[PDB]
Design a protein around this ligand. Structure first.
Ligand SMILES: COC1=C(OC)C(=O)C(C/C=C(\C)CC/C=C(\C)CC/C=C(\C)CC/C=C(/C)CC/C=C(\C)CC/C=C(\C)CC/C=C(\C)CC/C=C(/C)CCC=C(C)C)=C(C)C1=O
Ligand SMILES: CCCCCCCCCCCCCCCCCCCC(=O)O[C@H](COC(=O)CCCCCCCCCCCCCC)COP(=O)(O)OCCN
Ligand code: SF4
Ligand code: SF4
Ligand code: SF4
Lengths: 147, 157, 311, 58, 92, 165, 65
């Protein structure tokens, strides 16, 4: 239903990305791919990650790609691990056990991530910081022509 | 005609009311009549109070005030600016220079009236016209707009 | 469940009416500031002027500039209208008067604000005028450079609350409003919202409904940023801090009053100051607001952690 | 005294804000009978579900 | 928990409908390198604010360790920003 | 310089203290009487020397004052006046054609101050915008109608500047 | 038209009002047109035109005589 169409549109958008004549249309379908992926993540309950995908992918990287394409040239160009469950849910839906012990104090996807991103796995956080610093330094040295 | 004579009349009245209440002229300042236009839109006379607000581009203006001496070198630009405004458009000639050449009528480099380049709807006389004279000219243009019957004529053809 | 479109209409149509009357209010307040009167002939006090303007721009017999793909050009105003209105689904007006109560509302607002850059860019390229393209590029860069500072100020506010729910940020100000302690943060947020909307000293800049949609989207953004300013720092719908006898006034009135105050500040600031230059916009936004926002984040977090005043 | 004529459109904006706020408080209440609750967690969602089932039962 | 996004989707659909109605209303009757540097800086600081998002909310659980981890992260990006500053990439 | 001066000028840089001083002025002008006038109802002040629409005057006996001397036509810097004259049946020197180009007129008042009989004057009227170009080609009949319509005000004004001209 | 004195009435029915000013003036000589059909923007006779534009201090009833 909602998953099928939201995946089909993303596949069509990606196919148009890899097979686009005008790179501007490629950038637009590139944006649409992540627009659909954000909804797909929303279907999983990862509200934070979908919003970040909107913020990062089509807020920073897509804008940067658009800047590069526009102002520059606009030139031309299964059964082994997890066997699927067959649609037998008339009785399975009734067999749903809910444990209220895990619902009395429920964490959001945001605070669940932030509980261990900064204390128990902080070295990887600082390595990503170093990668960002490398990107900052390398952007200038490659592209810089003053006066 | 039991209701056409009534409904068409009312819808045409609505059209005329909108057009008279919101006029967006394009001031074509060329000479000392530009000072009078600026004085008209200032605090004393408040051309804004009637809904008139000036516009920089011809894409968004439905009126065009030619106020200043039109020279031979400037007439092509005048016509080009006029040709860029949308269809329900009017031209107001302000001052003697725009009307018939004025004090430079017998010059070798002056167009003897902006009506030789664009069709003029209202002529405002003066040199320079008083700001209240320009108010009277805009009011006369409003009165002329209220005479339009666009929907009735469209119905009758 | 068929009443959700009723709620969406009830939040969208009054928004458009308020945008039109906000344009009228701006043209009236500037006239009053400069010792004149705004539009007064059309209505009893000019209240009918926006309707006349709307019928004028509707009845113009305009032509479509089909000297382009005609798709991106026609949809860029539609896209910016999308983004401008979609952010109003989370802003609460009173206790339980929100259309969508997200638990990630602050981040959703940040995403919506960051996605508003595409409409102006697409409009700039689709117009064959290279100069309009460059102007749109400059405006996009400005919006980006100040959206960074807006996000940092959002972090400053979020530290003291502990949740991204907008309706809980207001309830967190029951003791005192966040505009009192973080007054420099409030000033910086207001200035950044001025620069984000391409307005005030930060406002460096075709026909019929495309330009109409761009205009409506920009003014809806102005209203939304005034709402955010009163939502994060002025206590939202909460009453005045002291003298609790006027509690008969509904909470939705206080939100409206504070929003009108901030809109008056927009009009006041634009009327009172000249324009900045582009070489000064970027320098200011990258050298005066980013360091200050980062320093305020650091200071607030350090002070709250030190005394264990965290949420 | 003289400045109130510029407060008319500005008060119309406030009325529009109030009507946007109050439309959802009397439309959502109309088909639910309860004002919208802020801060929905999975406990609240499941417990409203249990409410619906128990009301349907009796 | 995520039932509150369906109103947003219906809002998007109805906003699309009203925008199309508005469009149909009148139908019835060189290169500069600094534009790349600004985008690069925006990308870096957008990622920084993204990393602030979990830290601010969960600052009550973590205490004096997550705070200093975030401080080291900020120090590294501040050294990067200072390099951006003195190199003239912030000027126009 | 002084630490006190550095602190004082650094605070003013950060607290925007020279912009609050402009906001206060604009706000103080917000609550003030307006100086705009309702143009259709109230008009702006003028002077008895005002140079507006032209008018040809006549004697109280009903005889036109113009004696066809063409002294106004020779002084007109814009050449906006054309006069044709001949001997009338009574033998009096009168004009047959007296027309003024209002599109050439510069409203300088030279004709008014050159007339030896006070026949041509510029009345107080300034609201005569027309919808057609040749309605601005005033002739003798139009000018005489203007003189008859504005006779009392023109007479009062000419009485006022009798002490100056 | 409140706290104002009616100077005189015109042959067309127009009413002329006057208010006293002290230092800044404003709304001290205006007309209430007897018509409302767009009022033609020019209906003031010659005897009242001078009084309205502050050319002469005579009302216009006195200008007739
Ligand atoms: C810069 O020049 C320009 C202006 O002058 C400043 C404008 O005013 C404007 C636009 C001014 C306007 C009044 C257009 C706005 C019109 C609308 C928002 C139409 C809204 C109509 C509705 C929502 C339907 C009415 C709904 C109800 C009555 C329900 C009540 C609840 C533009 C576009 C412009 O380019
Ligand atoms: C109830 C509602 C109250 C009102 C709410 C709204 C408040 C705003 C009202 C309007 C205020 C005026 C708005 C004018 C808009 C344009 C102003 C921009 C001017 C500007 O950016 O100033 C810059 C510096 O000042 C700045 O940096 C300005 C930002 C300063 C923020 C304050 C930081 C103070 C920190 C003190 C902390 C102490 C307390 C905590 C211990 C540039 O100036 P420049 O040209 O000199 O360039 C600096 C080179 N060096
Ligand atoms: S009509 Fe007179 S004031 Fe106007 S532009 Fe010509 S010379 Fe100048
Ligand atoms: S006012 Fe001057 S330009 Fe006009 S007709 Fe008299 S002399 Fe000629
Ligand atoms: S109007 Fe005066 S100056 Fe002109 S021809 Fe007649 S008498 Fe002579």
């Amino acid at each position: 239903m909602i998953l099928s169409v939201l995946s089909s549109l993303a596949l069509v958008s990606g196919l148009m990305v890899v097979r686009a004549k005008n790179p501007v249309h490629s950038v637009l379908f590139f944006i649409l791919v992540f627009c659909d992926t954000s909804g797909l993540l929303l279907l999983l309950g990862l509200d934070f990650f979908a919003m970040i995908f909107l913020v990062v992918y089509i807020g920073a990287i897509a804008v940067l790609f658009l800047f590069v394409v526009m102002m520059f040239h606009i030139q031309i160009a299964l059964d082994n691990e997890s066997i699927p469950l067959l649609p037998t849910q008339r009785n399975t839906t009734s067999l749903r056990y809910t444990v209220y012990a895990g619902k009395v104090r429920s964490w959001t996807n945001l605070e669940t991530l932030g509980n261990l991103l900064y204390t128990y796995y902080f070295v990887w956080f600082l390595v990503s910081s170093l990668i960002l610093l490398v990107a900052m330094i390398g952007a200038i040295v490659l592209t810089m022509h003053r006066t | 005609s039991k209701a056409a004579e009534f409904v068409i009349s009312k819808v045409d009245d609505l059209m005329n009311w909108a057009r008279t209440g919101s006029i967006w002229p394009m001031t074509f300042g060329l000479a000392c009549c530009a000072v009078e236009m600026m004085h008209t839109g200032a605090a004393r006379y408040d051309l804004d109070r009637f809904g008139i607000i000036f516009r920089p581009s011809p894409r968004q203006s439905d009126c065009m005030i030619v106020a200043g001496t039109l020279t031979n070198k400037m007439a092509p630009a005048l016509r080009k600016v006029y040709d860029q405004m949308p269809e329900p458009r009017w031209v107001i000639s302000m001052g003697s220079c725009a009307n018939g050449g004025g004090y430079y009528h017998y010059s070798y480099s002056v167009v003897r009236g902006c009506d030789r380049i664009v069709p003029v709807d209202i002529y405002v006389p003066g040199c320079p016209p008083t700001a209240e004279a320009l108010l009277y000219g805009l009011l006369q243009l409003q009165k002329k707009i209220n005479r339009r019957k666009d929907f009735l004529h469209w119905w009758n053809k | 469940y068929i009443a959700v479109p009723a709620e969406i209409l009830g939040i969208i149509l009054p928004l458009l009416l308020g945008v039109a009357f906000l344009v009228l209010a701006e043209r009236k307040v500037m006239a009053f500031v400069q010792r004149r009167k705004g539009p007064d002939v059309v209505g009893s006090f000019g209240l009918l002027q926006p309707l006349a303007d709307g019928l004028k721009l509707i009845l113009k017999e305009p032509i479509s500039p089909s000297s382009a793909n005609f798709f991106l050009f026609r949809m860029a105003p539609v896209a910016t209208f999308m983004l401008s209105l979609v952010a109003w689904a989370v802003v609460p007006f009173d206790y339980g008067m929100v259309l969508s109560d997200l638990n990630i509302g602050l981040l959703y607002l940040f995403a919506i604000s960051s996605l508003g850059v595409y409409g102006i860019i697409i409009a700039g390229r689709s117009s064959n005028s290279k100069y309009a393209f460059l102007g749109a590029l400059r405006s996009a860069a400005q919006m980006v450079s100040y959206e960074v500072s807006i996000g940092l100020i959002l972090i400053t506010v979020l530290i003291c609350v502990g949740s991204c729910n907008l309706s809980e940020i207001v309830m967190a100000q029951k003791q005192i409003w966040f505009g009192i302690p973080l007054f420099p943060v409030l000033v910086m947020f207001f200035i950044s919202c001025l620069a984000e909307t391409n307005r005030a000293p930060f406002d460096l800049p075709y026909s019929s409904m495309g330009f109409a949609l761009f205009f409506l989207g920009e003014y809806a953004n102005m209203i939304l940023m005034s709402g955010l300013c009163t939502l994060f720092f002025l206590g939202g719908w909460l009453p005045i801090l002291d003298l609790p006898i006027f509690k008969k006034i509904p909470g939705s009135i206080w939100f409206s009053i504070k929003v009108l105050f901030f809109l008056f500040l927009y009009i006041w600031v634009r009327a009172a100051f000249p324009r900045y230059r582009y070489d000064q916009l970027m320098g200011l936004g990258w050298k005066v607001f980013l360091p200050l926002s980062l320093a305020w984040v650091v200071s607030v977090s350090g002070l709250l952690v030190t005394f264990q005043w965290l949420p | 005294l003289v400045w109130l004529e510029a407060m008319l459109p500005l008060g119309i904006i406030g009325g529009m804000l109030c009507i946007m706020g109050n439309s959802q408080y009397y439309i959502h209440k109309a088909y639910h009978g309860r004002p919208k609750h802020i801060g929905h967690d999975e406990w609240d969602v499941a417990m409203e579900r249990r409410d619906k089932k128990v009301v349907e039962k009796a | 928990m995520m039932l509150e996004f369906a109103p947003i989707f219906i809002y998007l659909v109805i906003s699309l409908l009203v925008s199309l109605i508005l469009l149909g209303v009148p139908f019835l009757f060189r290169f500069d390198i600094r534009f790349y540097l600004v985008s690069i800086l925006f990308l870096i600081f957008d990622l920084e604010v993204t990393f602030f998002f979990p830290w601010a909310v969960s600052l009550n659980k973590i205490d004096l360790f997550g705070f200093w981890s975030m401080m080291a992260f900020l120090f590294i990006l501040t050294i990067g920003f200072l390099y951006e500053w003195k190199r003239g990439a912030l000027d126009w | 310089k002084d630490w006190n001066t550095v602190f004082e000028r650094s605070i003013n840089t950060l607290f925007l203290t020279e912009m609050v001083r402009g906001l206060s002025l604009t706000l103080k002008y917000f609550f003030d009487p307006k100086v705009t006038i309702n143009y259709p109802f109230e008009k702006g002040p003028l002077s008895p020397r005002f140079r507006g629409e032209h008018a040809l005057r006549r004697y109280p006996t009903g005889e036109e004052r113009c004696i066809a001397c063409k002294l106004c036509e020779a002084v007109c810097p814009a050449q906006a006046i054309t006069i044709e004259a001949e001997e009338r049946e009574d033998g009096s020197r009168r004009t047959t054609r007296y027309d003024i180009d209002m599109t050439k007129c510069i409203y300088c008042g030279f004709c008014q101050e050159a007339c030896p009989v006070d026949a041509i004057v510029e009345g107080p009227n300034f609201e005569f915008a027309t919808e057609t170009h040749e309605e601005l080609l005033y002739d003798k009949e139009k000018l005489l109608e203007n003189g008859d319509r504005w006779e009392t005000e023109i007479a009062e004004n000419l009485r006022s500047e009798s002490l100056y001209r | 038209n409140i706290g104002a004195t009616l100077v005189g009435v015109d042959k067309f029915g127009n009413k002329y009002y006057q208010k006293l000013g002290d230092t800044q003036y404003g709304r001290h000589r205006w007309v209430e047109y007897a018509s409302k059909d767009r009022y033609n923007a020019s209906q003031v006779p010659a005897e009242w035109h001078g009084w309205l534009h502050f050319i002469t201090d005579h009302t216009g009833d006195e200008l007739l005589s």
